[PDB]
């Protein structure tokens with residue numbers, strides 16, 4: 027196992043920005059291998075006190091091996107920055123694709139859900155829960171296949187939350203926003219939120235305010251536009267249950283009649 031440094035890479039265009047992450051296209055000099063370099067500033071990490079999140083990200087993501095999960099090859103650091111060496115996803119984020127098209131048709135949506143459920147089934151078999159599934163963390167490979175990334179919030183179930191919720195509440199279940207304890211079922215709630223957003227163009231509990239978004243989530247207040255079909259409604263309604271134990275298993279999602287009728291990929 028080699029010990030990389032910044033000197034081994036030629037840096038290219040910015041691929042995107044996160045709260046801590048500044049991601050660049052890069053090429054390793056000796057092999058000409060194209061990859062993505064996720065740069066984090068140590069000062070910001072220490073200030074926010076999320077060293078443990080970064081360690082989890084490296085440990086968990088580097089060991090997982092699945093076509094629908096982004097690879098992490100390794101890491102290195104200097105006096106001021108930490109660098110994560112990632113698989114490069116050439117077709118961008120699902121987020122960008124959704125902004126381009128406004129909404130996805132039923133075939134595109136069902137295919138994405140199948141790929142997500144496949145990846146999540148792999149994760150949950152190791153009792154790994156992602157907890158931060160949202161469009162900006164879903165990347166696209168050269169064949170347009172979905173890949174889950176950003177495992178900074180991932181843990182082993184069961185678990186409590188010891189870190190401050192930073193941004194949007196839109197994809198989190200009631201048990202998580204209420205600081206209660208949670209398990210694998212949190213990812214299936216998020217899967218329901220995504221399926222809605224893919225078809226409609228916006229998440230089901232969206233509001234102008236943190237406080238009222240919190241209210242809509244804890245009370246599970248959502249409605250469907252007329253164009254959402256009966257099959258889609260059935261799947262979404264099953265996933266967005268307040269009681270975690272009533273949410274279906276991933277096998278049920280993969281074998282749901284609406285998924286099988288519209289997805290172009292299998293389990």
Ligand SMILES: Nc1ncnc2c1ncn2[C@@H]1O[C@H](COP(=O)(O)OP(=O)(O)O)[C@@H](O)[C@H]1O
Nearest residue numbers: 041042043044045046047049062113115162176
């Ligand atoms: N491997 C990659 N290939 C292409 N783009 C990426 C890759 N990793 C990250 N990005 C872009 O950078 C953004 C931030 O990456 P992410 O790891 O989610 O940062 P953070 O952990 O700070 O949220 C993503 O939303 C995506 O647009």
Ligand SMILES: NNC(=O)c1ccc(-c2ccc(Cl)cc2)o1
Nearest residue numbers: 030034054057059061099100111
């Ligand atoms: N497959 N297992 C690995 O560890 C692996 C495959 C490819 C790479 C890799 C690592 C560093 C750079 Cl710079 C470029 C490629 O690592």
Ligand SMILES: [Cl-]
Nearest residue numbers: 028029030034
């Ligand atoms: Cl080397």
Ligand SMILES: [Cl-]
Nearest residue numbers: 186187188189
């Ligand atoms: Cl936590």
Ligand SMILES: [Cl-]
Nearest residue numbers: 158191192193
């Ligand atoms: Cl979050």
Ligand SMILES: [Mg+2]
Nearest residue numbers: 044162163176
């Ligand atoms: Mg992210």
Ligand SMILES: [Mg+2]
Nearest residue numbers: 044176178179
């Ligand atoms: Mg992160």
